[PDB]
Design a protein around this ligand. Structure first.
Ligand SMILES: Cc1cc2nc3c(=O)[nH]c(=O)nc-3n(C[C@H](O)[C@H](O)[C@H](O)COP(=O)(O)OP(=O)(O)OC[C@H]3O[C@@H](n4c[nH+]c5c(N)ncnc54)[C@H](O)[C@@H]3O)c2cc1C
Length: 498
């Protein structure tokens, strides 16, 4: 049927949008292709941990996979599984694998919780048409509060075995003249202290994050989406995937929406129409919907920028082998707390999170997820034969990102007399993982495919809200930027359009 506003997806852009729509009195339906994650499973927990993956770990795969960096220790726990509506989706393109969350809350279910504001001078570089004072004065603070960002206690951090891995890389980096920074998070650090004291059920301290956290992590279902539901004007329908979007003859938008069960069986195909349509399906999902709509003729006035301008936030993973006298610990909190900030907006910039590893025994490995400044961009290109967007990104397009990450970590290795690991990513000697992405950005870039508030060019009352808006790079973990931009956008759209 008809509903005034429809929001596609339930990640950061979607959740912000729906809350503010509901507070404005606009009856809003959110359509989420994944599950509402609230049913205890066979182990009594909602989510599987990284040491006990099962079908809940994976969106329609037939075998579990080790977390990137940890195959050498965690392939032993991998098992065949039934394809199921699990929480983490590795989306494979030709030369890039993009990891995304599937469920009510999107990537907030599976992410590391790291809540980082971009450097203002970099924000101003990447989005020169956006008023940066309103962002820093109003919208970043608003996002920080609503997301429930918090800060680790420094004495606890210094003392606990669960962060030895972070302290080891801090000391090594310091020998190279390189500084670290604490990383704010939406995981409750007070709860985490109580986990270490044996006072509450463990989650971060029980090798959970990338398939969800059973405790501690304030994902969007607890924050923005709970508040949106609280308005009395928002509902969420799950296992509902939007397939097509058209402008109806009488105005507004009509959607074809497939309802499936958790085995992927098609239960129904529904038509849902609306006055206001907000896309929050992610960099991948929103862009795919719009490239499909353009190239199959259902939104024929979409512009040529739809699909363009994608980048992986310069994501590169690498690892160093510590000296035997610098063990990183068998017990590593699954939530990172420290990063190395070597980001000065130049082409050598690196912001790298000191990543835990889940093996649970001493490996001497330090793992890092680097964020770099690489101008290369890909394009999503509709394939009408398979009805899919294809991302045309080739691995050599990540050479600038690898080069920047390598130059930084070479400094650390030189200062400490250490070498890289070469065996963490596959059998072939490869120190830098250069064909994954946790932070997809772009495809429907703000001011290119849309106006400066995410209004899709060529259409009225059609909005994009999410990581597809960002021009390929933000220099930090992206969800705070997505959230703050979405706060800015929906406030203006409600005032001017609704
Ligand atoms: C392993 C991992 C670690 C990460 N760690 C961090 C971190 O610590 N800090 C950080 O800042 N970022 C992190 N990220 C990235 C962050 O989660 C991501 O940038 C945001 O979740 C993107 O938000 P969007 O709203 O764009 O989008 P997203 O959160 O991906 O949500 C899109 C939602 O739309 C749903 N959907 C898609 N298509 C459709 C459709 N056609 N119909 C219906 N529903 C649909 C989809 O299932 C999902 O629930 C991480 C991500 C991963 C995968």
């Amino acid at each position: 049927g008809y509903v005034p506003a429809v929001v596609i997806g339930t990640g950061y852009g979607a959740a912000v949008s729906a809350l503010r729509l509901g507070e404005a009195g606009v009856q809003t339906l959110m359509l989420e292709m994944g599950q509402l994650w609230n049913q205890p499973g066979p182990d009594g927990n909602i989510f599987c941990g990284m040491l006990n993956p099962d079908k809940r770990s994976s969106w329609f795969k037939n075998r579990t996979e080790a977390p990137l960096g940890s195959f050498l220790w965690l392939d032993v726990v991998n098992r065949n599984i039934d394809p199921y509506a699990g929480v983490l989706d590795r989306v494979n393109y030709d030369q890039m694998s993009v990891y995304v969350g599937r469920g009510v809350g999107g990537g907030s279910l599976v992410n590391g919780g790291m809540a980082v504001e971009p450097k203002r001078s970099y924000f101003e570089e990447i989005l020169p048409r956006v008023d940066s004072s309103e962002m820093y004065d109003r919208y970043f603070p608003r996002a920080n509060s609503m997301l429930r960002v918090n800060h680790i206690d420094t004495k606890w951090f210094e003392d606990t075995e669960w962060y030895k891995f972070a302290r080891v890389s801090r000391e090594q980096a310091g020998k190279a003249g390189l500084g670290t920074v604490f990383v704010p998070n939406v995981y409750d650090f007070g709860y985490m202290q109580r986990e270490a004291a044996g006072e509450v059920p463990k989650s971060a301290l029980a090798t959970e994050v990338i398939y969800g956290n059973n405790h501690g992590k304030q994902s969007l279902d607890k924050t923005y989406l709970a508040a949106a539901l609280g308005t009395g004007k928002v509902t969420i329908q799950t296992l509902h995937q939007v397939k097509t979007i058209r402008q109806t003859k009488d105005g507004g938008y009509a959607l074809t929406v497939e309802q499936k069960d958790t085995d992927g069986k098609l239960l129904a195909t529904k038509e849902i129409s609306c006055r206001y349509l907000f896309l929050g399906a992610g960099s991948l999902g929103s862009t795919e919907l719009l490239v499909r709509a353009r190239d199959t003729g259902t939104l024929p006035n979409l512009n040529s920028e739809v699909g363009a301008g994608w980048g992986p936030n310069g994501n590169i993973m690498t690892a160093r082998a510590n000296h035997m006298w610098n063990p990183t610990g068998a017990h590593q909190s699954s939530i990172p707390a420290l990063g190395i900030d070597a980001w000065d907006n130049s082409d050598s910039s690196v912001f790298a999170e000191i990543a835990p590893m889940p093996a649970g025994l001493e490996t001497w490995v330090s793992l890092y997820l680097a964020i770099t400044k690489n101008p290369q961009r890909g394009t999503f290109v509709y394939d009408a034969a398979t009805d899919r967007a294809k991302l045309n990104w080739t691995r050599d397009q990540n050479a600038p990102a690898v080069n920047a990450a390598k130059a930084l970590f070479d400094r650390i290795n030189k200062a400490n007399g250490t070498i890289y690991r070469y065996d963490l990513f596959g059998t072939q000697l490869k120190a830098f993982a250069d064909d994954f992405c946790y932070h997809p950005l772009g495809g429907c870039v703000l001011g290119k495919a849309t106006d400066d508030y995410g209004r899709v060019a060529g259409y009225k009352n059609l909005y994009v809200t999410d990581g597809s808006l960002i021009p390929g790079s933000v220099g930090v973990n992206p969800f705070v930027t997505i959230t703050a931009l979405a706060e800015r956008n929906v406030e203006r759209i409600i005032k001017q359009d609704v």
